[PDB]
């Protein structure tokens, strides 16, 4: 399925100035604007101020006046937005109106992979930022899958690009004191966690694509391959042996950054994420290898028996190893326990 949005139309375009390393708006105004002129898109600019403030806007927004809803930011924006659609009491039709990213500056790996897509070389800054713009100015739209999230809390969250614990969680958390480093924060982090590795104590169980197929199953939404996280997980699913982890990763994208080409075996299919994990016992020679090869996607060709791949439809992930954090969508969260399922062509991206 395909989409297009009119001409002339007209966007709602939420930027974070505090945000590309406080360069965002300047980007907006030299960069994206002069092309959207040309294109006959008009827009309105509103500003962000902090956490969540896009989340409450979007909630209680006027969706009917926009063609669009554009996203000037990094990845956490975007999750703001589409966790405030699918609050709404009209979420199901609030979910379909067209979102579109555009990166300002700090990276932004859902924007690197809509580039990706389109054909593009693996370009950062304002060559992404552009080729992301052009994209909006061409007005094809994409279906994208959704990742929904449940809690042992009883939290309820929605995923559009991932979900890490463990190895690549601890990086982002450590990598908000470095943002004045931009995108590189996250190498910064990721050489002070490989100095000092640990494993995290925890049990995964999945829900491989093979096994059920994507077809959303008749029991919102409602993730009716799920069963209550008290009990245990259906017998048809994959429970993974190992009890510890260096880290484990839910991926609905191609890229983790706009030189991280993390999941390079093809674009996700509809209703299906990459899952990843790594074994305890890899060590920090191999992970360091593997790091620096996912910048062109070579980090499989290794076949690192650590590294387990498999694409599913479903999740569940039972951290055991104390205080810790899930990074959603880059965003830090306590963690618990937690499961997923992927809703297929749930929403459209410019792309
Ligand atoms: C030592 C190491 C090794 C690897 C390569 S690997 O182990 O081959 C691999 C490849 C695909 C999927 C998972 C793992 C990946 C890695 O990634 C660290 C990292 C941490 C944060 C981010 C940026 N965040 C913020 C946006 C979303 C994303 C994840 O939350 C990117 C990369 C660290």
Same mark, same amino acid.
Request: net charge neutral.
């Given at each position: 399925? $395909?989409?297009?949005?009119?001409?002339?139309?007209?966007? +709602?375009?939420?930027?974070?100035?505090?945000?590309?390393? @406080?360069?965002?708006?300047?980007?907006?105004?030299?960069?994206?604007?002069?092309?959207?002129?040309?294109?006959? /898109?008009?827009?309105?600019?509103?500003?962000?101020?902090?956490?969540?403030?896009?989340?409450?806007?979007?909630?209680?927004?006027?969706?009917?006046?926009?063609?669009?809803?554009?996203?000037?930011?990094?990845?956490?924006?975007?999750?703001?937005?589409?966790?405030?659609?699918?609050?709404?009491?009209?979420?199901?039709?609030? /979910?379909?109106?067209?979102?579109?990213?555009?990166?300002? @500056?700090?990276?932004?790996?859902?924007?690197?992979?809509?580039?990706?897509?389109?054909?593009?070389?693996?370009?950062?800054?304002?060559?992404?930022?552009?080729?992301?713009?052009?994209?909006?100015?061409?007005?094809?739209?994409?279906?994208?899958?959704?990742?929904?999230?449940?809690?042992?809390?009883? +939290?309820?969250?929605?995923? &559009?690009?991932?979900?890490?614990?463990?190895? /690549?969680?601890?990086?982002?958390?450590?990598?908000?004191?470095?943002?004045?480093?931009?995108?590189?924060?996250?190498? +910064?982090?990721?050489?002070?966690?490989?100095?000092?590795?640990?494993?995290?104590?925890?049990?995964?169980?999945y829900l491989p694509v093979g096994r059920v197929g994507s077809?959303?199953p008749?029991?919102?939404?409602?993730?009716?391959h799920?069963?209550? +996280?008290?009990?245990?997980?259906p017998s048809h699913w994959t429970?993974?042996?190992?009890?510890?982890?260096?880290? &484990?990763?839910?991926?609905?994208?191609?890229?983790?950054?706009?030189?991280?080409?993390?999941?390079?075996?093809? $674009?996700?299919?509809?209703?299906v994420?990459?899952?990843?994990?790594?074994?305890?016992?890899?060590?920090?020679?191999?992970?360091?290898?593997?790091?620096?090869?996912?910048?062109?996607?070579?980090?499989?060709?290794?076949?690192?028996?650590?590294?387990?791949?498999v694409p599913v439809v479903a999740?569940?992930?039972?951290?055991?190893?104390?205080?810790?954090?899930?990074?959603?969508?880059?965003?830090?969260?306590?963690?618990?326990?937690?499961?997923?399922?992927?809703?297929?062509?749930?929403?459209?991206?410019?792309?």
């Amino acid at each position: 399925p $395909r989409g297009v949005l009119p001409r002339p139309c007209r966007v +709602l375009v939420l930027l974070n100035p505090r945000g590309g390393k @406080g360069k965002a708006l300047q980007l907006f105004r030299s960069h994206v604007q002069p092309l959207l002129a040309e294109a006959e /898109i008009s827009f309105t600019l509103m500003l962000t101020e902090r956490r969540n403030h896009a989340r409450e806007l979007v909630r209680s927004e006027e969706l009917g006046r926009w063609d669009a809803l554009v996203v000037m930011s990094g990845d956490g924006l975007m999750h703001e937005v589409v966790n405030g659609l699918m609050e709404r009491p009209d979420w199901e039709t609030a /979910i379909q109106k067209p979102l579109c990213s555009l990166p300002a @500056g700090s990276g932004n790996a859902l924007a690197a992979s809509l580039n990706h897509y389109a054909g593009y070389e693996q370009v950062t800054n304002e060559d992404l930022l552009t080729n992301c713009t052009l994209l909006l100015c061409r007005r094809l739209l994409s279906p994208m899958n959704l990742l929904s999230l449940h809690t042992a809390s009883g +939290l309820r969250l929605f995923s &559009v690009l991932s979900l890490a614990w463990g190895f /690549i969680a601890d990086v982002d958390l450590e990598s908000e004191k470095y943002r004045r480093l931009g995108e590189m924060r996250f190498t +910064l982090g990721t050489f002070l966690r490989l100095a000092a590795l640990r494993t995290y104590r925890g049990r995964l169980a999945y829900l491989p694509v093979g096994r059920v197929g994507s077809k959303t199953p008749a029991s919102g939404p409602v993730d009716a391959h799920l069963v209550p +996280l008290e009990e245990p997980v259906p017998s048809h699913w994959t429970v993974v042996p190992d009890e510890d982890f260096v880290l &484990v990763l839910a991926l609905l994208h191609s890229h983790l950054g706009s030189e991280m080409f993390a999941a390079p075996m093809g $674009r996700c299919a509809a209703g299906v994420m990459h899952l990843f994990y790594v074994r305890a016992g890899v060590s920090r020679a191999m992970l360091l290898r593997l790091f620096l090869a996912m910048e062109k996607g070579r980090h499989m060709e290794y076949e690192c028996p650590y590294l387990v791949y498999v694409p599913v439809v479903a999740f569940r992930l039972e951290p055991k190893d104390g205080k810790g954090v899930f990074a959603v969508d880059g965003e830090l969260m306590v963690s618990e326990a937690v499961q997923g399922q992927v809703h297929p062509n749930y929403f459209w991206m410019v792309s």
